Amino acid sequence: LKELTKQYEKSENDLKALQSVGQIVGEVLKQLTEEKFIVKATNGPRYVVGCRRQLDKSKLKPGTRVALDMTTLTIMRYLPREVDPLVYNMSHEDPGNVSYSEIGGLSEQIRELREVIELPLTNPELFQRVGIIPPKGCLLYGPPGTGKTLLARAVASQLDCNFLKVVSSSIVDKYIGESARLIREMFNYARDHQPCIIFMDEIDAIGGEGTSADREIQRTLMELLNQMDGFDTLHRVKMIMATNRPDTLDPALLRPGRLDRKIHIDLPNEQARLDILKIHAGPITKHGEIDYEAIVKLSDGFNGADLRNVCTEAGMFAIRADHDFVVQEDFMKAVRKVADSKK
Template sequence: MPAGTSAMDPLREKAFQDYRKKLMEHKEIESRLKDMREQLKDLTKQYDKSENDLKALQSVGQIVGEVLKQLTEEKFIVKATNGPRYVVGCRRQLDKNKLKGGTRVALDMTTLTIMRHLPREVDPLVYNMSHEDPGDVTYSAIGGLQEQIRQLREVIELPLMNPELFLRVARTELRATVVSSAIVDKYIGESARLIREMFNYARDHQPCIIFMDEIDAIGGRRFSEGTSADREIQRTLMELLNQMDGFDSLGQVKIIMATNRPDTLDPALLRPGRLDRKIEIPLPNEQAR
């Protein structure tokens, strides 16, 4: 028995060595396989990107137009961006109820068929307003203004968050913060256009709260004489008043304006129906401090 055992030891040792060698080879192959899978994943992404780029190069562009009028169930009068007007059809899968006057659409380059409807054209400045971070400040972090906070919540939050009281289902979300002085543009008509696009964007993304800081920059008292810049500000104010007159008091778009100079504001801006509640924010009292 001892002689047989001693004869088996070299065989057992050799078997263990072969096992360890194969185990190391297996681990090495597993590592290489993992690397190759990662390479395959990267190559697949590159292939998909190349396919998309190739399709983009081979595809035909589309013309941006605007629907002017619906003639029949299948025919529409559209105006292309370069000026001419056409009577065209639309794709069958398209929802024709969305093709109303003023809707932006994409037209086929060859047949001018309406391929899809496009969202409203929005100025980048207006678009960026909805992506501002309102921060994490709560009402509890504000001291000494309980009455003002109560009035503010009564005017803004209650109509949006209590449908059983105001017959509207809504939720409140601060979507836009505007510094009024940033609206004033040196080009004639640009400021009024920005106001118009801002309110249209708010209507399309209800519920929405528009907060306009430093409103005295565009809402000052009007007068007959002044420079071209003053006249541009007056045109901006007229557009603002026009947009405010088109709002429903129980709607889902609310407007808040702030100023340090209420004495300079135009009376037309302060009349009931436009700004229904005036809230003065005083200095904090001794208890709040």
Template sequence: MSDSGPSTSAPAASTSAGTDDRKTAALTAYRQALKQHEELSDGLKRLRFGLKDLEKDYDKTEDDIKALQSVGQIIGEVLKQLDEERFIVKASSGPRYVVGCRSTVPRHKLKQGVRVSLDMTTLTIMRVLPREVDPLVYNMSIEDPAGASFAGIGGLGEQIRELREVIELPLMNPELFMRVGIKPPKGVLLYGPPGTGKTLLARAVAATLDTNFLKVVSSAIVDKYIGESARLVREMFGYAKEHEPCIIFMDEIDAIGGRRFSEGTSADREIQRTLMELLNQMDGFDHLGKTKIIMATNRPDTLDPALLRPGRIDRKIEIPLPNEQSRLEILKIHTKPIAKKEELDYEAIVKLSDGFNGADLRNVCSEAGMFAIRDDRDYCLQEDFMKAVRKLQEAKKHESKIDYSAV
């Protein structure tokens, strides 16, 4: 009876050991199957994303093939609407047609003068095209005034206030003028010696208001072909009206705005025609419209009186040479980013720079930096600025003097 205990416990132990082995094997197999399942799921996801990319490539290729196989379209101009479905259109080649309109084209946009594309065979209006813009006018609009601000202009507080009254108030708060019952000015003339900040003021106004900005160099408008200059002026104002609010800045206006006279060459007469078109365009837009003009010149005495009369250029702002206090403000603005070892004696530099304009003072800072580089230093000293002022004083002796009187 004593031998029966061990003989029964041995099979039980072996049975439990076999069960543990099977459990371990099953768990291992399960983990492997789970891992394979996860790998297959990841692979399936990648294939799905790859399929989407392939579908996009397929659609793009299909569109490219259609574009290559499709026939081009004719450009035309709407002359008149006859009824809901028919329009008189002038094709770019010259002849006029009575044509239909595609169902997806909005009818309310098909007004006189609108550019459209026509099907090559049926001459049906396929789509409305944007207004044609002269490349010269488009290049004027690329000018970006960003970066300019009133904080970067020193010594012109009164001029900035006057300019903002003329340009900023009518654009931001036109109801103020309507309440008082007056018409806001259409434009402003900035005049004064070169280098005093006329262009910088105009750029700062446009950047502050976040408006469209057309920078026009007046001499670039003049064309040798008769009528081209006047057409450019029309294009310029048309573009500005379509992209309101817009500021047109005409630099060196004396190039086309000089006094008219009876005698002269054909080139002089073309400039006079350009001026007449400019006067006509300035008379043509609304006082409370969102197109404003800023003109700049350093020769106000040569401008035509018709251009300067109230109703066209209502405000004339003189930008004078900076006085001692203004030069101090300008100098502090330009020396701010410059590496300096010690605090500068601004008063001494300002007293030595009598007759300097804003551009001269910026040049003083550049020359001081050049002296530092020449001495193999990475910072500027007081002596560098003093030497720079003396150097520029010698250079300014060669500049001609022009006397400015208030316009």
């Protein structure tokens, strides 16, 4: 009888369930009085509805989802904000957890970028204690592939703050005013999701003359510049716009509260090649000893992005050969493969 009882009791809830009706899910959009709202069904007319007596008058603020009754059209209970990956914004792109230690040979540069970006977000007291508005924005310039993005990605991982990555060159679309609009949606997106490191990729495109299209670049800079030092809201989000060419960038863009700190990140540090390989080499099993030093000179002017491949490409050499890397002979050719074939 005990087995029959637990199933029978669940069945009794189901008999009640058959009775229960559905609520037309909708969103509130105004509050005319203390008993009247203007609710919109998800794909439905806008009904003027009241709220059930056992509801919080307040909690129902514009934007607050509700599920009104299907006949009374009186709201019966709030609901959480709908969550779907319908977002068009990289914002959800988790940086992923990357420790500062993983970027290699940028101790000073990483230290600086920590200052401007990390500080205003974590210990604002220091800035408000001295009375200066928190610094906002870091301009990371350096040779391509050196790893500007990663440092900007680790900073997000330490702070646990949402990161939005914009390929700046892409934002400059051909049709007029699209280019300003993409920048505008970025900062407007930030207001909704705080705090977000807005990492702009090569910024030479938008910042740095007589043609219709030669002033669209001019307009887009003005939109970028305004959204920073701009009436609206000053905000708490930070931007890490990184370029490859710092002479091109316009003067206004490099200012105290409008993007400061020209952190230079040159090709992997001489010693870094070790650290970078150290941080990027060890993962792959490789019992054999390493003459890293020769790999260092075997890899002069290496982009660092190449160094990541060096070890990985070596793994493919190992993926053929056998299954365990036991020889530096591998990195040598791997260094070549990540040089002549990386040209």
